[PDB]
Amino acid sequence: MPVGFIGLGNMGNPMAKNLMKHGYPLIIYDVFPDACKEFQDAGEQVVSSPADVAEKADRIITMLPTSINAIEAYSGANGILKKVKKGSLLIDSSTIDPAVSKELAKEVEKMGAVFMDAPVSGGVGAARSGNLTFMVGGVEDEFAAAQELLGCMGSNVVYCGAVGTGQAAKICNNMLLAISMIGTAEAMNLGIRLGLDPKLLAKILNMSSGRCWSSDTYNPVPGVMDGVPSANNYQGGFGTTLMAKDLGLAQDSATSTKSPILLGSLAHQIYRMMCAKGYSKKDFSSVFQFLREE
Amino acid sequence: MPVGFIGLGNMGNPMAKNLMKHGYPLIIYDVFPDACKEFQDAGEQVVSSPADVAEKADRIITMLPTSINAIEAYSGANGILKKVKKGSLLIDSSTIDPAVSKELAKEVEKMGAVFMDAPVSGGVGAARSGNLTFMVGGVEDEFAAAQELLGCMGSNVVYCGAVGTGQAAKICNNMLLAISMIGTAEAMNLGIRLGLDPKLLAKILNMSSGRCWSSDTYNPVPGVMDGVPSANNYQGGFGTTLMAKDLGLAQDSATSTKSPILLGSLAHQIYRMMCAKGYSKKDFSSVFQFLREEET
Numbered sequence: 355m356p357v358g359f360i361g362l363g364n365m366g367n368p369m370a371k372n373l374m375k376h377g378y379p380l381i382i383y384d385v386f387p388d389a390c391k392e393f394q395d396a397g398e399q400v401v402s403s404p405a406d407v408a409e410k411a412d413r414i415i416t417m418l419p420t421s422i423n424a425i426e427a428y429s430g431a432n433g434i435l436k437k438v439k440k441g442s443l444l445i446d447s448s449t450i451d452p453a454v455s456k457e458l459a460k461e462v463e464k465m466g467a468v469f470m471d472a473p474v475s476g477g478v479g480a481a482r483s484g485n486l487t488f489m490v491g492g493v494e495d496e497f498a499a500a501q502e503l504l505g506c507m508g509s510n511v512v513y514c515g516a517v518g519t520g521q522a523a524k525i526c527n528n529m530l531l532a533i534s535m536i537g538t539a540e541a542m543n544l545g546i547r548l549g550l551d552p553k554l555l556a557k558i559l560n561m562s563s564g565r566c567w568s569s570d571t572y573n574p575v576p577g578v579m580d581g582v583p584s585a586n587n588y589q590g591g592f593g594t595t596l597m598a599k600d601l602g603l604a605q606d607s608a609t610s611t612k613s614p615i616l617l618g619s620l621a622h623q624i625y626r627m628m629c630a631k632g633y634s635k636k637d638f639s640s641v642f643q644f645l646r647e648e
Numbered sequence: 649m650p651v652g653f654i655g656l657g658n659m660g661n662p663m664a665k666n667l668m669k670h671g672y673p674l675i676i677y678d679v680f681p682d683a684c685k686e687f688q689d690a691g692e693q694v695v696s697s698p699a700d701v702a703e704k705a706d707r708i709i710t711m712l713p714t715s716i717n718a719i720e721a722y723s724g725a726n727g728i729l730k731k732v733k734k735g736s737l738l739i740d741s742s743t744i745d746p747a748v749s750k751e752l753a754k755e756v757e758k759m760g761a762v763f764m765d766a767p768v769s770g771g772v773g774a775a776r777s778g779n780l781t782f783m784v785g786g787v788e789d790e791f792a793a794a795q796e797l798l799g800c801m802g803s804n805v806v807y808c809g810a811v812g813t814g815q816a817a818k819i820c821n822n823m824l825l826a827i828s829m830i831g832t833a834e835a836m837n838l839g840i841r842l843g844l845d846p847k848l849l850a851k852i853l854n855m856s857s858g859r860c861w862s863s864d865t866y867n868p869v870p871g872v873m874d875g876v877p878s879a880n881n882y883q884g885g886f887g888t889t890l891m892a893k894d895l896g897l898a899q900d901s902a903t904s905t906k907s908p909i910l911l912g913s914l915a916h917q918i919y920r921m922m923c924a925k926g927y928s929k930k931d932f933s934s935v936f937q938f939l940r941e942e943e944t
Contacts, residue, residue: 452842475856512852522842523852530835530858537827540909541820547905548746548816554808558817562769564824566860611841614939615834617911624910645908
């Protein structure tokens with residue numbers, strides 16, 4: 355029983371590898387043939403199009419960088435829908451607009467197949483270890499089937515509701531993350547400028563009502579925590595460009611649903627600014643470096 | 649050996665009571681004589697001014713609502729400073745501007761006494777149970793002595809550095825809380841308007857990178873958590889007025905230290921707007937209710 359995998363970037367590659375570690379035969383496609391060679395050298399079937407993946411696999415995982423790439427992989431000239439068979443399970447782990455997930459779902463449904471959005475949180479490390487969180491939207495009858503596949507690539511797989519709810523949960527999490535990370539940077543910087551030792555203030559934040567994941571798990575001030583990007587000049591981690599993309603999705607959804615987001619809008623514009631100022635390739639926690647005045 | 653206590657509001661009262669539970673004789677003042685009657689009925693000495701407290705006690709705790717009330721208690725016509733004895737330990741648990749704490753300390757020092765700022769986090773519940781956090785600034789030689797008193801009233805007593813650093817620590821914490829509470833409210837509201845069950849979204853936030861104290865211990869959405877103000881129409885807890893005050897302090901300190909606070913500023917103005925729109929006596933988590941679309 356082969357599984358299709360489309361998109362083998364910094365996330366898709368380790369995700370696919372974890373499926374192979376669980377004994378799944380794979381049918382592979384990426385627009386970059388060089389990203390496929392690694393898997394071909396190891397007995398996995400590499401094909402020429404997403405349609406060709408659907409021709410040979412009744413379960414497919416798509417992992418793509420953008421809304422546009424995702425719709426191209428499904429509705430494009432050689433997209434999955436051109437050759438998708440009845441009763442096929444299609445799981446999109448791309449992070450995209452909830453509304454686009456819904457539109458995609460309506461299209462696969464016309465073909466008598468099932469679509470589920472399952473965007474991931476965790477990053478390259480969790481992708482490699484198989485410790486990702488999947489936030490899953492779609493018909494709940496199909497969740498159990500999906501969980502069998504996703505459980506091989508992630509440690510938590512959560513049913514969020516109907517199609518697009520996975521995207522919605524992920525987008526809302528990351529918006530709150532950005533707000534709190536910037537908040538942490540702002541409070542730490544103010545604290546230091548007020549004459550506080552950063553390590554002491556982190557300690558106070560982390561035993562008080564200010565405690566958050568940003569401050570206790572991913573502190574943006576160099577020297578406060580080991581093993582976080584601020585320890586290493588903001589290398590790796592979760593890229594500022596990626597954070598800005600996610601906040602763009604939050605912003606678009608907030609306008610669409612007429613939800614007021616004062617802090618979320620500002621977080622978005624701040625990370626947008628950072629993209630234009632040389633932070634695009636730095637971990638998003640670099641906002642502290644953006645704020646602080648040496 | 650008696651301890652002075654000035655200011656017996658919703659925080660001062662239970663704080664003073666915990667000192668009595670530890671065996672400390674008290675010398676009391678509050679501008680409201682009615683707030684003193686309770687302590688007089690029980691064998692504590694009530695006097696007529698803060699100066700009169702200083703005349704009889706070599707260690708004094710002040711617990712006042714504002715910067716102005718604090719400086720009046722010290723520097724006023726009948727303030728501590730008029731009758732303070734040398735070697736006196738003076739601890740201000742009021743939440744006030746760090747720069748004002750420094751000014752007070754310099755004045756106290758002229759009188760050969762010691763000043764320490766020890767603002768509290770925890771609220772009337774923690775005040776009552778003795779589970780307050782004290783964040784303490786001042787000469788560190790004096791911290792151990794202070795900790796003996798404060799430890800009777802709080803479960804954590806943390807040395808933050810020189811005078812004003814306790815105020816600094818508390819102000820930075822509350823700014824980050826305001827930002828995160830508003831953030832949680834915004835993310836929850838957006839989730840709900842996107843069609844998510846709030847309980848589910850809370851669960852997701854609380855197992856992910858979005859998890860904060862606001863979302864996992866004090867969730868602003870009614871029905872998500874028991875035992876938080878949102879389960880109770882935002883009654884009690886930590887008042888919006890008080891959150892706005894504290895953010896005012898962060899704003900002023902941010903200006904003074906020239907620290908850019910983009911989200912902290914907006915958090916401040918948002919809570920300011922809430923105070924003028926009926927929220928001032930509701931718990932600060934009512935920001936969710938403030939964001940929510942009302943039927944019309």
